[PDB]
Amino acid sequence: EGSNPVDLSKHPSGIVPTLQNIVSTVNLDCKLDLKAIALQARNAEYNPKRFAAVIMRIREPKTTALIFASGKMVCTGAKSEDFSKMAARKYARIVQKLGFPAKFKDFKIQNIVGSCDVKFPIRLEGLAYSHAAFSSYEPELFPGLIYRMKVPKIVLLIFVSGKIVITGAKMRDETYKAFENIYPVLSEFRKI
SS (H, E, C) 119-185: CCCECHHHHHHHCCCCEEECCCCCCCEEEEECCCCEEEEECCCCEEEEEEECCHHHHHHHHHHHHHH
Q: Beta-carbon neighbour count of residue 157 at 10 Å?
A: 17
CB 91 within 8 Å of CB 32: no
Can you give the residue range of the structural domain that contains 187?
13-23+110-191
Tell me whether residue 2 is in a domain. Answer: no
Is residue 128 domain-shared with residue 149, that is, in the same domain?
Answer: yes
Is residue 38 domain-shared with residue 105, that is, in the same domain?
Answer: yes
CB 25 within 8 Å of CB 75: yes
* Experimental technique used to determine this entry: X-ray
Q: Which of 69, 88, 109 is the last residue of a domain?
A: 109
For residues 33 and 52, give the distance between their C-alpha atoms in angstroms, rounded to a whole number: 12
Tell me whether residue 8 is in a domain. Answer: no
Per the structure, the count of domains in the chain is 2
Resolution (A): 2.1
CATH of the domain at 91: 3.30.310.10
Provide the residue type at 39 as one letter.
L
Is residue 114 domain-shared with residue 173, that is, in the same domain?
Answer: yes
Tell me whether residue 6 is in a domain. Answer: no
Pair type for strands 72-78 and 18-27 = antiparallel
Is residue 46 domain-shared with residue 98, that is, in the same domain?
Answer: yes
- CB within 8 A of 2, min separation 6: which ones? none
Is residue 124 domain-shared with residue 158, that is, in the same domain?
Answer: yes
Is residue 95 domain-shared with residue 149, that is, in the same domain?
Answer: no
Smallest Cα–Cα separation from 89: which of 73, 110, 111? 73
Q: Which of 70, 88, 109 is the last residue of a domain?
A: 109
Q: Which of 109, 143, 160 is the last residue of a domain?
A: 109
Smallest Cα–Cα separation from 157: which of 116, 121, 109, 112? 116
